[PDB]
Amino acid sequence: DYRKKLLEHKEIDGRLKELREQLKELTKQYEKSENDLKALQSVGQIVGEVLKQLTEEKFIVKATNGPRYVVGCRRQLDKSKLKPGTRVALDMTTLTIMRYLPREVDPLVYNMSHEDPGNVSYSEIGGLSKGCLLYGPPGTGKTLLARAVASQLDCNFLKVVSSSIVDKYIGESARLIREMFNYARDHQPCIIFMDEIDAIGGRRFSEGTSADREIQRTLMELLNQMDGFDTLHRVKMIMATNRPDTLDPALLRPGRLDRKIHIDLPNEQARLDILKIHAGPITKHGEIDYEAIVKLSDGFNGADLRNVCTEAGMFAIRADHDFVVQEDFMKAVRKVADSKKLESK
Amino acid sequence: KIMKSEVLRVTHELQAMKDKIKENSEKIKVNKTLPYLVSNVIELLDVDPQRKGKCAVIKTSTRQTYFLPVIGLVDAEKLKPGDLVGVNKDSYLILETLPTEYDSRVKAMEVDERPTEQYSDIGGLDKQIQELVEAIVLPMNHKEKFENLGIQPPKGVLMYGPPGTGKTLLARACAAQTKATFLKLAGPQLVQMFIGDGAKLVRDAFALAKEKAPSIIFIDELDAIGTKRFKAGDREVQRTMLELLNQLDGFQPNTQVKVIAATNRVDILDPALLRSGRLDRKIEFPMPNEEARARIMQIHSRKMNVSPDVNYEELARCTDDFNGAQCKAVCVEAGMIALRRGATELTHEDYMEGILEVQ
Amino acid sequence: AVQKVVVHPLVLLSVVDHFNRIGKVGNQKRVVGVLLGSWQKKVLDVSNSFAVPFDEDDKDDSVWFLDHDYLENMYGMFKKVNARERIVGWYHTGPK
């Protein structure tokens, strides 16, 4: 009688205290609405540029539209940012200065913003313990690793695509080799990725045309800046490709590519580790046996092993079964992997 | 319960807040009614040293540059360098941002809602088309099971084979089953007179696929521009093409709308087209035999008044090394001269008459 | 906390209005007005203000009459027309 009323009143108090969270959470956003409505009251600002300063207090501004004006100094700001050569902002009333406007390339934001999150990718590369060559034996992952450390820190996102040395006009790409590598020599930290270099890696065996001679001339600038009269002790380049046969044996000198990393799945612990990191979100039956999948797989591609395992998960979803036994893994990874061996020419 | 009696005052304050938000929330309609012009927005992060640094660069349509910080409501897809933003008369604030992509010559390339033909128009290809029918039905309805199993559908499917096989009308026939928006694109459309057009066409395709609703983008004649030359125009198509491959390799959020491709020949096979997001689904579509051609010609000719005395042996013998769209042209031609033959019923000589007529 | 304040003559001319709209009744007591300003910055800047009907008792000094609904309505409408200024304090015209 008395002992039950404390628990019952605890239940009424429970259902009474469980209704505040449905309102007090959205009231912060509702008040944030009026906070923004009070934040949109700072309006009517214009821009300008400073060329010549006569008086330390009042100088000449240059507007983007073309007409020039002169403004004063606001009591809040100081003479630090007031020096000429810094783009600033102005107001329509009294031509006061609220703050400055830092310059940037319309494109510099694109070249300095593309970023890729994910910090576990550095430890999701599997059992893998002045230039690096990522060649193309029967095993993939050249992009998941470079994008794994590049997604970890990379200190930048200086990606160099092999399609940026096209130079449709006269082949003066030396301005871009010295321009971008001059940016690499300017910025103290720099990491360079060179993916799919086989397209620009012509062996120039026979007499090349004008299209090949300019690309091989950019390769001559690469020679002149790797083993020429310029060291590359601090900058690092990652030459990724697809076929390790046409990789410019003139460029295959060990003076540039110190080590060679054959991206494959040789070790049973590396294939088992990559199989376990790719087999994370998949659900299976209690019968688990990875040694048959790892043992039967010999010299395959990592991401394509993910595509074959998920292809076996779809072969198992054809029968719309929630649980997925490893029989379709052995027979579907077996048969589909044999089809990859057929299409591995 | 004496300590829990103060909750009533809190609920009265909250319902009073809901009663008082109607006015300041009501002026949203009269202040944010209509942005009268369109102004381009360029994102540029500033630093104030709360007193936090946040600003943006504005450009009006009349070529006038002004100054304003990043303001408005809660932004999720905003803060991108886009156009068609909300702005009042003279205060120049940002109220309603909406992406423009406007250059309608590329935006309105092929505005198709849905086609008429379906997958039940062919015969003898279920063993090789069933994988594609699954690969378009299960990624559209079974998104829930993709989290229990951890499955991400591939975005590049290579529908390759000899020409004239009707792969375009067949992929469109499956696009009727996709129920999504169908958007064609031709290979020779990337080669333009001006420079950098292919970047606008590719970023436009991923602008409508990325921005718009879940759709279907089927391209064809990709082999006509997929040449791996070692100036050259196909190397410019290597700039645009390798740019697209960079947008299918460097973009992990590419889990959105797929990109279906079809090549009429595999002579110049680009080796860089092998990836989970790239053209990994390589299902070979050979030339249909006389049996399969009699099947697709029978189902494509099931509407005309065909004579029941068809043993398919004469047409099976005459159809040697033919294709799907060729027998479709024989069916259409038979439906063309069968009208002027007087007999409303399709005869048996019209098959070889059309075969020797158009071929 | 606050080293100096800035008071515009608009509020004191609103005290001239306090002495104008009396109506010759014979009270002329310490009419209390609701002072408004900008408390955001360290310096205080009075832009404008308004008043509230304030009446005391003759003998008892502890009698004071204010209004919450008039303060929330005048402050609500004034904040609706100008949200850059909020309540800060008050002021009385009495010399003692």
Side-chain angles (χ1 to χ4, degrees), chain A residues 9 12-13 16-17 19-20 23-24 26-27 29-34 36-37 39-40 42-47 64-65 76 87-90 92 98-104 106 109-110 114-118 140 143-144 147 157 159 161-168 195-196 198-199 202 209-212 214-215 242-243 278 281-283 303-304 306-307 309-311 313-314 317-318 320-324 340 343, chain B residues 1 4-5 7-8 10-11 14 17-18 20-21 24-25 27-28 32 42-49 54-57 59 62-69 71-74 80-81 90-95 130-131 134 138 142 145-154 160 193-196 203 228-232 235-236 238-240 242-243 246 249-253 270-272 274-276 278 280-282:
Chain A
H9 287 88
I12 279 99
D13 290 330
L16 184 63
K17 73 181 181 180
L19 58 94
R20 294 190 299 272
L23 294 175
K24 72 181 179 67
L26 48 87
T27 52
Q29 295 298 110
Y30 283 168
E31 185 67 28
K32 187 176 174 66
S33 68
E34 290 101 13
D36 292 331
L37 290 172
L40 267 72
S42 66
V43 291
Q45 299 293 320
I46 205 166
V47 296
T64 305
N65 201 3
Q76 182 62 255
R87 188 174 180 87
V88 297
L90 306 176
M92 60 178 288
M98 295 296 172
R99 62 184 181 271
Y100 68 96
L101 183 62
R103 64 178 177 87
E104 181 178 359
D106 174 2
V109 178
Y110 289 163
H114 176 89
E115 190 293 331
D116 192 75
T140 192
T143 310
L144 293 175
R147 199 178 67 189
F157 195 69
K159 179 68 174 66
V161 186
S162 66
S163 67
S164 178
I165 321 100
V166 279
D167 199 353
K168 293 165 67 172
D195 187 75
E196 204 261 333
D198 55 353
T209 186
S210 66
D212 185 75
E214 60 183 1
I215 299 169
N242 290 319
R243 291 185 292 173
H278 285 292
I282 184 69
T283 181
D304 291 331
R306 189 261 187 189
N307 291 119
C309 290
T310 56
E311 185 68 27
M314 289 178 283
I317 211 168
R318 292 176 67 188
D320 62 27
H321 284 89
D322 50 354
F323 65 94
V324 175
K340 295 295 290 183
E343 292 292 328
Chain B
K1 65 182 181 180
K4 273 78 175 176
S5 179
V7 185
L8 277 76
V10 177
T11 59
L14 295 177
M17 191 68 202
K18 270 79 173 178
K20 73 178 73 174
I21 50 97
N24 54 13
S25 74
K27 73 176 184 291
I28 303 298
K32 267 67 72 176
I42 294 172
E43 181 64 27
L44 190 146
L45 183 63
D46 198 359
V47 51
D48 185 74
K54 188 182 287 185
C55 179
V57 176
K59 272 93 169 65
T62 182
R63 290 189 294 271
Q64 291 179 356
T65 303
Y66 295 96
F67 189 78
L68 57 95
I71 53 174
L73 271 300
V74 176
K80 64 182 182 293
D90 207 1
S91 85
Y92 294 159
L93 58 89
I94 295 170
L95 54 96
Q130 187 176 2
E131 184 67 28
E134 291 176 353
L138 73 91
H142 295 89
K145 292 177 72 68
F146 285 166
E147 294 293 327
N148 288 318
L149 300 172
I151 304 299
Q152 296 294 321
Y160 65 96
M193 181 180 177
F194 291 162
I195 61 171
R203 292 177 67 88
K228 49 180 183 293
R229 289 183 180 178
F230 296 99
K231 67 182 291 294
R235 182 166 51 83
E236 307 170 355
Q238 285 177 357
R239 181 185 69 184
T240 300
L242 284 175
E243 183 179 1
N246 193 9
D249 196 3
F251 286 164
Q252 56 180 357
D270 194 2
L274 295 174
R275 191 183 179 272
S276 179
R278 293 179 182 176
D280 198 4
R281 298 290 182 89
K282 294 188 287 184

Side-chain angles (χ1 to χ4, degrees), chain B residues 6 18 20 24 27 38 93 138 168 171 192 194 199 207 223 241 243 252 259 262 267 293 296 306 312 320:
Chain B
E6 294 293 327
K18 270 79 173 178
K20 73 178 73 174
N24 54 13
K27 73 176 184 291
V38 175
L93 58 89
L138 73 91
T168 302
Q192 298 294 321
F194 291 162
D223 58 352
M241 182 177 71
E243 183 179 1
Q252 56 180 357
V259 177
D267 52 355
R293 288 191 298 267
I296 58 98
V306 179
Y312 296 98
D320 291 331

